[PDB]
Design a protein around this ligand. Sequence first.
Ligand SMILES: CCCCCCCC/C=C\CCCCCCCC(=O)OC[C@H](O)CO
Ligand SMILES: CCCCCCCC/C=C\CCCCCCCC(=O)OC[C@H](O)CO
Ligand SMILES: CCCCCCCC/C=C\CCCCCCCC(=O)OC[C@H](O)CO
Ligand SMILES: CCCCCCCC/C=C\CCCCCCCC(=O)OC[C@H](O)CO
Ligand SMILES: CCCCCCCC/C=C\CCCCCCCC(=O)OC[C@H](O)CO
Ligand SMILES: CCCCCCCC/C=C\CCCCCCCC(=O)OC[C@H](O)CO
Length: 270
Amino acid sequence: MHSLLIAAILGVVEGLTEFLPVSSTGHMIIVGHLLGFEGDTAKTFEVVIQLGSILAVVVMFWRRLFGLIGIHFGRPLQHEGESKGRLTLIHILLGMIPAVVLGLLFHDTIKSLFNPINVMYALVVGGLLLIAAECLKPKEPRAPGLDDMTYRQAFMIGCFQCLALWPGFSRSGATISGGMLMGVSRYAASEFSFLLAVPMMMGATALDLYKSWGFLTSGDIPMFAVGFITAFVVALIAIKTFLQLIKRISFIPFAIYRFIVAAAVYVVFF
Ligand SMILES: CCCCCCCC/C=C\CCCCCCCC(=O)OC[C@H](O)CO
Ligand SMILES: CCCCCCCC/C=C\CCCCCCCC(=O)OC[C@H](O)CO
Ligand SMILES: CCCCCCCC/C=C\CCCCCCCC(=O)OC[C@H](O)CO
Ligand SMILES: CCCCCCCC/C=C\CCCCCCCC(=O)OC[C@H](O)CO
Ligand SMILES: CCCCCCCC/C=C\CCCCCCCC(=O)OC[C@H](O)CO
Ligand SMILES: CCCCCCCC/C=C\CCCCCCCC(=O)OC[C@H](O)CO
């Protein structure tokens, strides 16, 4: 079926690009345009399949996330770091505060000024930031592992997450870049970005799904579902492959890829 095929394709796109630093939103406006799936219900279907990508992070970091909110299951938590420190909820809170504050003050201002030309610029500037992070990061990470991160790095990553309010910038791209610039290794900054994404995207999805509840009907449920679980499965593959890959390559190829996507935005919309 046309509808379910679209849901699977967009689910694959969402699951691949939500946690790679390449702007799921940038890919979604392109693919949704090439499939004819563009209206108000499409912009809420894409909010719903973002819950699928979240769930993949929740599943992969299950024991870590529950431990952060004070629920520890049996075996002690796997320690990832060179120090005796442990990532805490304060790290997560500090990483949330800046984008939460700026998001609440400017979310409506950003949404009403949406445009594919802005996503194109965000794809380029975000790619340039990734390049700058790779070029300017210290030779020796200050936080090689997730549990080595400081309140200060977490808060600075939180400040960089405000760049994600710019559509097309890639929440993951902004936070990993800011993390790398603060001396967090690629791997640990990627993990922290994914953990941070759980409260950020769950709050953002609940907010946009509430404001857009009027569009939905009973007939969208079968399509909204197939995209959810496609995004979930693909994100599960993507996160696991990305974390294995980012130990061996840099973000230079992702930054260059974003330049290609930005050109694709221009040729598809202009
Ligand atoms: C949904 C639209 C498509 C999804 C968008 C995908 C974005 C991928 C872009 C750039 C990644 C390039 C780097 C990843 C490719 C590396 C392949 C590889 O094999 O690198 C291993 C190397 O040998 C080291 O060990
Ligand atoms: C498509 C529209 C996109 C619009 C936005 C694009 C604007 C580009 C801005 C800056 C790029 C050039 C950056 C300048 C590079 C400086 C390099 C440097 O300073 O070198 C120091 C060196 O590392 C000492 O060791
Ligand atoms: C070769 C095939 C085509 C390749 C694409 C065309 C090349 C120019 C395109 C985009 C600008 C890339 C900007 C590169 C910025 C520096 C890259 C780099 O060497 O990173 C430094 C390193 O990580 C620390 O020393
Ligand atoms: C907030 C929005 C984001 C805006 C993003 C603008 C993009 C700037 C473009 C290129 C900068 C690249 C600078 C590269 C300078 C290289 C310096 C260097 O060589 O490294 C020094 C030292 O080794 C390090 O620890
Ligand atoms: C870490 C992972 C790095 C590896 C990188 C992942 C490689 C994924 C490659 C292709 C998937 C994209 C397939 C889905 C997009 C194609 C469908 C599409 O674009 O729809 C256009 C439509 O058909 C026109 O009418
Ligand atoms: C229509 C849309 C098409 C979009 C097209 C994309 C535009 C790419 C822009 C700038 C890339 C060049 C800026 C890279 C400059 C960084 C080089 C640098 O900073 O040097 C590395 C450092 O010295 C290491 O030691």
